[PDB]
Design a protein around this ligand. Sequence first.
Ligand code: NAG
Ligand code: NAG
Ligand code: SJ5
Lengths: 385, 74
Amino acid sequence: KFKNSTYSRSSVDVLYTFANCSGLDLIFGLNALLRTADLQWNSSNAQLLLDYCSSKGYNISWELGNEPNSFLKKADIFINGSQLGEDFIQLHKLLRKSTFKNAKLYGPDVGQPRRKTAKMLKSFLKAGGEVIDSVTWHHYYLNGRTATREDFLNPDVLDIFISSVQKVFQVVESTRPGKKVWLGETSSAYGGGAPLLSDTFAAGFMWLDKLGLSARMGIEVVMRQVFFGAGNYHLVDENFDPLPDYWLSLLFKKLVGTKVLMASVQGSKRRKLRVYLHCTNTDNPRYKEGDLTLYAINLHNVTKYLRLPYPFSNKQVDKYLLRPLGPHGLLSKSVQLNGLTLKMVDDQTLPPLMEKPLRPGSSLGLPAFSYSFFVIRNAKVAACI
Amino acid sequence: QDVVDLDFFTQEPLHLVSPSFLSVTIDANLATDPRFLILLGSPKLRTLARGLSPAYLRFGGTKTDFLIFDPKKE
Ligand SMILES: *[C@@H]1O[C@H](CO)[C@@H](O)[C@H](O)[C@H]1NC(C)=O
Ligand SMILES: *[C@@H]1O[C@H](CO)[C@@H](O)[C@H](O)[C@H]1NC(C)=O
Ligand SMILES: O=C(O)[C@H]1CNC[C@@H](O)[C@@H]1O
């Protein structure tokens, strides 16, 4: 299927300047199917690339291989996880004998447990686990080709993710306990996303739930496939318009801090009403130390009213409720914040994100098939300080 | 009833995520698009990307293990 392609120093400069002037930390994945007679990693090509990156003063981090479980399927070449570990070390040496010898190294970007990926990942962590600064794996819920609207709305589909993570932390605790665990590449649906699904309001259920569970289960970083490109799961389409997952991501970034807490519903069902709690993000100038950010998903077909527990029952709450702009409802490519359509003011200018303050003491209104942030002002949680 | 009671654990941080918790990718295959330069050049797109700082941008995908650096190339 897939054949070899070249890229120019030029290509590199595009990608670096994109990230640099955007304020993001480029991680660059290197070609791992460059092989020596004895099926070792031939490092010469990467070596050329590092010289150029070094020779430009490029602040860049590194990966080696993507979904190595597939190589046999992909390029009729099987690499045992042991050898891949050995290649990771060869690369760590090359990084150490470079100008940025502190540069971070992440891997091995294996597919989820469902892909029979355990043996490769256990052998790879035993072999080369010492030289990587984070473990990277990939997750998709569905096949893009077969995924339905009802799949996107199904809590039983969302729940499979929990076990995925558990099975990963099982391999890592058994070989490199305390090593940081990263989703290296993840979205709704593989083969580029589900057409008319992966790019709508409906995609928001799987995206905000994935973020909630990842934070809750000790995943340190989640990498969204993709910010921009061919695939239906892009945050920004081919006409550089932001899709509803993008507005969800932005609202998440303003409101949610680094300190993960826990919320749960009193019922014997915590399936269709999904709740997450963090400390409010400190960098946000509207809010002070002690403040909580609750985020909630409602997959019931009616409004649910959420009651804050003692002693936060009478606090002032700011609502950030997201709902699709009609007429395509959950299949819409446009979203409203507290009943205001979200759009760039112009190409240089993002809009304000306007809270809706609730009367202190009111139950928290969460309409059917909807997700919301609730900031609890003056919560005064010491753990958040 | 459609009224639900929540329980909160607020004693201590259960985990600390990166400040780059919500990060993003560009698929390696975007660099086989002739219009690559124009696309990532897009100022509008950079306004959108800057909104997600701080974050990692991971450049990878299936094409990772099928791409070769040509420093002779244009
Ligand atoms: C590695 O690849 C280069 C070309 O990139 C080739 O000329 C060289 O002989 C290879 N080295 C080994 C030891 O396989
Ligand atoms: C809403 O969901 C219920 C299950 O709780 C389903 O059986 C029902 O058909 C839906 N609404 C109506 C009016 O039937
Ligand atoms: O299937 C998908 O959508 C993705 C699976 N992981 C590799 C990506 O190149 C690919 O785009």
